[PDB]
Structures are given as C-alpha cells and as structure tokens.
From a paper:
Porphyromonas gingivalis, a black-pigmented Gram-negative rod-type bacterium, is a keystone pathogen linked to the onset and progression of periodontitis. In many bacteria, the enzymes phosphotransacetylase (Pta, EC 2.3.1.8) and acetate kinase (Ack, EC 2.7.2.1) form a key pathway for production of ATP from excess acetyl coenzyme A (acetyl-CoA). Pta produces acetyl phosphate (AcP) from acetyl-CoA, and AcP is subsequently converted to acetate by Ack, with the concomitant production of ATP through substrate-level phosphorylation. In the current study, recombinant Pta (PgPta) and Ack (PgAck) from P. gingivalis ATCC 33277, encoded by pta (PGN_1179) and ack (PGN_1178), respectively, were prepared and enzymatically characterized.
The structure of PgPta in complex with acetyl-CoA was determined at 2.0 Å resolution. The asymmetric unit of the P21212 cell contains one dimer. Domain II is responsible for dimerization. Structural comparison of the subunits of PgPta in complex with acetyl-CoA with those of MtPta showed that both subunits of PgPta are in the open conformation, with a root mean square deviation (rmsd) of 0.89 Å (314 Cα atoms) and 0.90 Å (318 Cα atoms) for subunits A and B, respectively. Structural analysis revealed an acetyl-CoA molecule bound to each subunit, with seven direct hydrogen bonds or electrostatic interactions between the bound acetyl-CoA and subunit B. The adenine base is recognized by two hydrogen bonds with the main-chain amide and carbonyl groups of Val150. The 3´-phosphate interacts with the side chains of Arg89 and Lys92 in subunit B. Arg135 forms an electrostatic interaction with the β-phosphate. The second amide nitrogen is hydrogen-bonded to the carbonyl group of Ala175. Contrary to predictions, acetyl-CoA molecules were bound only to site 2 in both subunits of PgPta, even though crystal packing of PgPta does not appear to interfere with binding of acetyl-CoA to site 1. Since interference of the binding of acetyl-CoA to site 1 of PgPta has not been observed in solution, such contradictory findings might be due to crystallization artifacts.
Residue numbers in the entry:
A (entry chain B): -2 to 334
B (entry chain A): -3 to 335
Write the structure that this text describes.
Amino acid sequence: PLGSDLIQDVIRRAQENKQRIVLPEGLEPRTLEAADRLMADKVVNIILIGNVDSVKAKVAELGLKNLDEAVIIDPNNHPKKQQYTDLLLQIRQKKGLTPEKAAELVENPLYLGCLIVKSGDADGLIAGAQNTTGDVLRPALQVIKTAPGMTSVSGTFLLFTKAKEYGKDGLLLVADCAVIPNPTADELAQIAVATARTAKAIADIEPRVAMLSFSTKGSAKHEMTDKVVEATRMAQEMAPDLLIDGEMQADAALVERVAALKAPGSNVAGKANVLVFPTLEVGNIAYKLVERLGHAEAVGPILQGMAAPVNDLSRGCSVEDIYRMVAITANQAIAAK
Amino acid sequence: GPLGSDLIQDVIRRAQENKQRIVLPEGLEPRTLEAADRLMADKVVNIILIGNVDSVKAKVAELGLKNLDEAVIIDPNNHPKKQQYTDLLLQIRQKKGLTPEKAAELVENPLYLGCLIVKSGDADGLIAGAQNTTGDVLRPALQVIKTAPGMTSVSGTFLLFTKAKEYGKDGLLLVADCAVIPNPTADELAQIAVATARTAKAIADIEPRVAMLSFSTKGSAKHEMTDKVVEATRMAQEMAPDLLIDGEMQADAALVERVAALKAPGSNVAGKANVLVFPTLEVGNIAYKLVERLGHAEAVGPILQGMAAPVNDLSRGCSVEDIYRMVAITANQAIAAKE
Ligand SMILES: CC(=O)SCCNC(=O)CCNC(=O)[C@H](O)C(C)(C)COP(=O)(O)OP(=O)(O)OC[C@H]1O[C@@H](n2cnc3c(N)ncnc32)[C@H](O)[C@@H]1OP(=O)(O)O
Ligand SMILES: CC(=O)SCCNC(=O)CCNC(=O)[C@H](O)C(C)(C)COP(=O)(O)OP(=O)(O)OC[C@H]1O[C@@H](n2cnc3c(N)ncnc32)[C@H](O)[C@@H]1OP(=O)(O)O
C-alpha cells in the first residue's frame, strides 16, 4: 500500500504513451497471466517469444482472453531472422562471434528479444521469471548496450518508507543496490546521474542527490571519502541541470538540522530524495535493513543506464509484480526517447 | 524514547544493585554535573569529579545541585596519588618516548588523570566528551587503559531499538562497528564480532546470534570484499566457540526465517540474528542512520567496546538524560569486566 499511489501514476503514464514490450519467456504462466492483464488494461503492446502454436496452446490452456492482439515471434522461424542475425554479427563478430554461432544465438529468446529492441521493433524487454539475472543482463549489455555518455549500468530501488517527512512523501530512490560491487569514482558519478534521471522518469520527482559517505564535507577524511568527493565533482560536471551534492552522511542527507550544521548552503542536504551509496556492501545491506527493520516497501531492482530498458524479474515474482515492472519499463522507454 | 525505555530501566537497576565508581573528568561541565546529581540522588553510581575543589563546589552551588556533597572531587594539580599516577604513566609509556617532564604535564590533564584513576583500580569506568572531541577522549584511554585480554581493537556499537518487534530481541539489535574503525581487516572484524556479542550479553541480556553481513550469502556472490567477511567469520568462531556467529550473509538472510531456509540452511544464526556486524564503517555509519531516520528506530550509543575497563564518549550536544543513561551503561560494562 506504500507506493500504490505512485505505481498507479506509472501505469497511467504507460497507458497514455503506449510502449512495445518484449517478453522472451513466452511460455511462463506468471508472465502470460501478467501480459493478459497488461493488454486488458492497455498498459503496453506485448510481444511474446515462443513457438506460435505452443504459446497459443498455453494461452488457451490458462484461459486467457486478452492476448489475441499480442505479437508472437518464433525464434526458429520469422521474417527478420537474417536481418537480426546480420545485426548481431555487426555488433559481436569482432568480439569472437562466428556466423556459425550467431545463427545459434539469434534463436535464443533472450538474444532475439534484445535484437528486437535494438532494431527499434520494440521499446523494452522484461525477463527473469525463468532465467538467472546473468542470462538476462548479458545479452542486454552485449546487444542493447549503454545509453549515450554512460559505460555502466546499475540497479536502483524505489524505497517507499513510512517516514513521510523524508524524500517525496516517504519515497527515496537508492542505488547502486544490485550490480557494481565497488564503483570507481567515474562509475559512481554515472550511478548518480542515472538514478536522478530514473527519479524524474518513474517517480516524477525533482531529484536532489546525496552522495553518501561516513564523512560530511571533510569531517572524516579517508581514502574511501576521496572517491565520493571525486564522484560528486564528476557528476556535477556531467549534469549541470541536476542537484547533486556530497560527500555527506545519511543524517546530513535527510535531516535539516544536521544539514544546517554539517553541510550549510548545500541545495541537497536536509532535502535528499535520491541516495547514492559508495559500494554494493553499503547499498545491498542498507536497503534490506530499511525494508525489514523500517517496514519499508522496496520495488526493484530497476536497471538503469541501458540505451533501451531491460528489467530482470526474480524467479518468485508474482503476476502483480511482473505487471508493475512492465509498467516501470514502459516509463523508462518513454524517458529513453 | 519509549522503544528503549524498558531496557534502559533494567540497565539503571542493575547498576544500582552493584554500585560502581565512575570518573567524570569534565567536572565543571553543567550537563555532566546535573547528570551526576541525578545519578547520586538515585544511587546509580559513586561519582568522582575532576577539577579544582573550590571551583567545582562553586559550580555545584551555582547550578543549585543538592545531591553532590558526597561526590569525590580530585584536583588534578594537587591530590594524594599524583606521584603514584605519574610513575604509573611513565611505566606505561616510557618505551614510547614519554619523558618525566611530559608525564608531569599529562598527569594534570583531566582525561589522562581520569584514565590513570581507572587503570590503578581507583575507579571502574570513565565518561567524557561533553566538552571534548572523541579523539581527545579515546587517545588517553587507548594509551593508558588499553584493550581487554585477547583483543587489540576497540569498536563502537549501537543499541538499535526498532519498531519491527518480530526481529532481534523484541525489535532490539546490536550493530557494530558504526563509529571507530573505517576498514577493519578480517582479524579486526572477528574481534568486533566477539566484542559486540559479549556487549549484547552484558548490557542487553541478549543470547547473541551474530550475523557477519555482506552482499553475498554463503558464497552466492563471491568477490574480494566477501573474502574478508568469510575469513572474519572463521576467525571469530575459532576465538569464541561458546558464541553463535555465522556469515557471510545478507541482511535479509540474517533477519528473515524464510530467506534463511533458502540461502543459509543449517545456519544456527540466519533468520534469528540479533547482532549485526558490518564489513566497513561506510556500511555501519550509513545503515544505522537510515534505519534510525527512515525506520523511526531509536539508536543508543555509540558504546565503546574492547577496553580493559570501560570508557565512553558522549556527543557535544548530549542531553542530561543521555549522560545519565551512558553512565548507567558504563557501570554495566564494568560489572561485566570484573566478572
Ligand atoms: C561477480 C559477482 O558475483 S559479485 C557481484 C554481485 N552482483 C551481481 O551478480 C548482479 C549482476 N552482476 C553481473 O556481473 C552481471 O550478472 C553481468 C552479466 C554484467 C556479468 O557479466 P559476465 O557473465 O561477467 O560476462 P562478462 O563480464 O564477461 O560480459 C558481460 C558484458 O557486459 C559488460 N559489463 C559487465 N558489467 C557491466 C556494467 N555494470 N555495466 C555495463 N557493462 C557491463 C562486460 O564488459 C561485457 O561486455 P563485452 O562482452 O562487450 O566486453
Ligand atoms: C577521522 C578520520 O580521519 S578516519 C574516518 C572516521 N573515523 C572515526 O570517525 C572514528 C574516530 N576515531 C578516532 O579518532 C581514531 O580512530 C582513534 C582515536 C581511535 C585513533 O587516533 P589517534 O588517537 O590519533 O591514534 P594514533 O593513530 O595517533 O596512534 C595510534 C595508537 O592508537 C592505537 N589505536 C588506534 N585506533 C585503534 C583502535 N580502533 N583500537 C585499538 N587501538 C587503536 C594504535 O595501535 C596506536 O597505539 P600506541 O600509542 O601504543 O602506538
């Protein structure tokens, strides 16, 4: 119930600017059920990957009545197979892919799905109900690649807290909580800019980005603090339109009275709604403790920094969670154009 | 507030039942004196104040405090044990190049004198930092009192009283190291784990189950940074076979039975943790503050651990009630150290 209002807004913005979303796991029942609801509610235009007769059989078997307009693409046989094979070789031959092996890969639903998006025949992709994170992300990084002026992808969570005096009515975006173990200064700056733009695209927030540390504005100098200082500088340079400040402690980021004392004349401190963590140790631990010990609702991870949005579901994701992640993906696609 | 109030009441009561001698080096600081007055009224501890006797008595009369006539006041410039404490200080710090000339200056510094009083067995613990920096409190404590048997590192723990009563002990977890060591080695992290578990036992009447946290659970995400937590876990288990310590694990595996069953089957900690050990100060400093603010948890501390006799450091903005509370904690640490 925390963040059902925001998710309702995300669904509506998807509905108002309809994106084409590829679901490579076209025989997975949770995926198909979610696809049926998304098409009933006209949230997105669905593309399912699988043998056409098998997918249609499974749709009829699950009693789904809203998928007649879904496009179904058999990776073994479809009119753009050679085109996508040629595109794949163009992207990946140099990197050791033979035409022999390109012909195999193009028949793998995850690779095919990424090539559909990359070609401009779709706007985004969701998988991972029946694949590992790595098998989803790898083709996405190889084929779709990163957005202009970015070399790294990262994972953000929407963190809907019960503390409505922080963030946007209790919501903060937090990153990187899933992908990069130990970002360099450069990576951390890219995380900062990416998360701010996700904040704008998904949460309709005016981002104020806190680059977190155990130091605030030189209070605790150390090797680990220097990286966050450099990251802050480089983020500010990469994006002069965005409010980004650091290094600061979490209390300076969130609490006006502490901001006044330790970070005076920051335009972020005391008002942060985006938190950038210096390592995955920090991010992975911190968001889970806020989720459990704070009773916060965490939505994600949401992958950011891709030229076109790919998201990765968990293997235990509900129908409603798949629906939700597709709606988010559509919003990321709108932002990417 | 109300989350911590039952346990803090127990801590004060256990102090009252075995009265310890606590040194307050900042003997003219008004918040400290007010707290000392309440502690003496309530018979929580025997207070020792450091300062010129006439000045301290003048300040006591000036603040209208009626319960400090039995407080011991030691003037650092002139008191019966000055040469004894000076000789002790030279004996501890001669190797390290302290001259008798410089010993004679240091022994007159209230923070050094306070530590020598404890070290000599003339007190049981010390509290300062209302008017001194953390570093000026810690330095004499580490030089004079030093670390407990079998420990080389001192760390800081918080009592974290959360609103999630289904975790920890009715919502309480101890977390460390959240204040002192920026980047513990594997050995330091193991010592943090054993120290915090024993603090948990002594202060919070917790049966410690210690989770060594990482972004990996039992080899799920192997990496350079996870290796330190794996090694720390092994070394902690070896140092303390009487304690339940496991790792590496994620915070969800530490706290959630359903996740523990999947990611850490046959841990005797996972899903039941009540002590969390963080791999770095970045993690600890950020994580406890986010839980405090975003979770509405109450955090008490930092509490210093690993000292041969307890020294605690107050913040410069600490209330009278917070000083009272920290003195009660320190007395409980002394009771644990003597046992
Ligand atoms: C390694 C650990 O288990 S600890 C980290 C804990 N976190 C996670 O596991 C979550 C996901 N982490 C990952 O590493 C992802 O699963 C993966 C898919 C990016 C790793 O991919 P790998 O199987 O290592 O393949 P490899 O790194 O050889 O190739 C993946 C491609 O993406 C690139 N890449 C890897 N990480 C990133 C990133 N964060 N951003 C952008 N590109 C990346 C690689 O350079 C490579 O590109 P290339 O083939 O064009 O050179
Ligand atoms: C503040 C920064 O720049 S780093 C990042 C943030 N850190 C913090 O917020 C924590 C605050 N901590 C501190 O002030 C320091 O860590 C201190 C006080 C513990 C150490 O600083 P100093 O008192 O100047 O110690 P210094 O480095 O001068 O001397 C080291 C001595 O203390 C000892 N020591 C230092 N830290 C510790 C510790 N955590 N545990 C045990 N012993 C210690 C050394 O072994 C050495 O002993 P010796 O006198 O017998 O040689």
